Amino acid sequence: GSALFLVIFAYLLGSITFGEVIAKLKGVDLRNVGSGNVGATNVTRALGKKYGVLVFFLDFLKGFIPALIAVKSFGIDSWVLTFTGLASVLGHMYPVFFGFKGGKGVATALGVVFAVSPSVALFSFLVWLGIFLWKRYVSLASITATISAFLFLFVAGYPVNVLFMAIVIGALIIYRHRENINRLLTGREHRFGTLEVLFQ
Ligand SMILES: CCCCCCCC/C=C/CCCCCC(=O)OC[C@H](O)CO
Ligand SMILES: CCCCCCCC/C=C\CCCCCC(=O)OC[C@H](O)CO
Ligand SMILES: CCCCCCCC/C=C\CCCCCC(=O)OC[C@H](O)CO
Ligand SMILES: CCCCCCCC/C=C\CCCCCC(=O)OC[C@H](O)CO
Ligand SMILES: CCCCCCCC/C=C\CCCCCC(=O)OC[C@H](O)CO
Numbered sequence: 001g002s003a004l005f006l007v008i009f010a011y012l013l014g015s016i017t018f019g020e021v022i023a024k025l026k027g028v029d030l031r032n033v034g035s036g037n038v039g040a041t042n043v044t045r046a047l048g049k050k051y052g053v054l055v056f057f058l059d060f061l062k063g064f065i066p067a068l069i070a071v072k073s074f075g076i077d078s079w080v081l082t083f084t085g086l087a088s089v090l091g092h093m094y095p096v097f098f099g100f101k102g103g104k105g106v107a108t109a110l111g112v113v114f115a116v117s118p119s120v121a122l123f124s125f126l127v128w129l130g131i132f133l134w135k136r137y138v139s140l141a142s143i144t145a146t147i148s149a150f151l152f153l154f155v156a157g158y159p160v161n162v163l164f165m166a167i168v169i170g171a172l173i174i175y176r177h178r179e180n181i182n183r184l185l186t187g188r189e190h191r192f193g194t195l196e197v198l199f200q
């Protein structure tokens with residue numbers, strides 16, 4: 001019973017459109033700018049990195065808080081954790097709040113992973129940072145770091161319930177990047193260059 005309530009809590013906390021609450025206070029509706037989605041990436045597009053970092057933290061806490069309750073109440077080997085983390089990420093991407101669409105969900109997914117293993121989350125972040133500084137594609141770093149988190153969980157000996165959670169979350173994030181992949185492979189993906197470092 002408490003397990004079903006935690007999975008529902010994870011879906012509803014993960015549903016919260018923090019990006020939209022913060023964008024509206026700055027006069028912006030995120031459905032009418034950039035990707036049309038609510039998340040740290042589209043908040044960064046509309047409002048810049050100061051607001052982006054705040055929404056990244058908040059979206060991270062959407063994955064972090066239910067998964068930490070599941071780890072502490074049920075355990076790393078509980079399928080309760082599996083469905084709590086999946087609920088947070090599907091609630092972010094496809095919220096109960098009809099008429100909104102979540103962003104690709106890297107921040108929310110990272111919060112889930114950090115609740116399971118802070119070491120895995122930091123190493124996944126370091127992989128992201130390495131690829132980003134090398135190639136200057138955001139999408140390439142995110143896709144590669146998402147697979148890396150799965151590999152680190154596998155090599156570290158996390159059980160099948162955790163690897164199942166990681167593979168499905170990973171698969172959903174790669175699916176949300178499908179056009180980035182098509183652009184990367186056809187030389188159409190925008191790189192993070194001097195004007196992107198500087199003007200905004
Ligand atoms: C490009 C090729 C480079 C070669 C790649 C080899 C990778 C092999 C992994 C070794 C694991 C060593 C121990 C990993 C860290 C570890 O055990 O955890 C730390 C703490 O938990 C947090 O700092
Ligand atoms: C800039 C935005 C990004 C935000 C990123 C940093 C967020 C740090 C939050 C909480 C730390 C509390 C420590 C939690 C410890 C934790 O996860 O413990 C699980 C067990 O280790 C699993 O068994
Ligand atoms: C344990 C490890 C913790 C990890 C700490 C990570 C902190 C990330 C900081 C900012 C995110 C800003 C929001 C993302 C912006 C973004 O992806 O922008 C691409 C767009 O293409 C822009 O046009
Ligand atoms: C299976 C779950 C694993 C999931 C763990 C993810 C890896 C963590 C890496 C970096 C965090 C900072 C990322 C900052 C850039 C960012 O938010 O990028 C958005 C999209 O890639 C834009 O297209
Ligand atoms: C990124 C490559 C994708 C391919 C991975 C290759 C290496 C790791 C293999 C398996 C982990 C399995 C974790 C998922 C377990 C799975 O499918 O769950 C069935 C249930 O356990 C039935 O009860």
Ligand SMILES: CCCCCCCC/C=C\CCCCCC(=O)OC[C@H](O)CO
Pocket residue numbers: 146147148150151166167169170171172174175178179181182
């Ligand atoms: C740790 C992560 C493990 C990952 C496990 C497997 C991941 C692959 C699954 C889905 C990708 C979806 C791709 C859908 C293909 C598709 O619809 O193609 C459209 C074009 O690429 C342009 O729209």
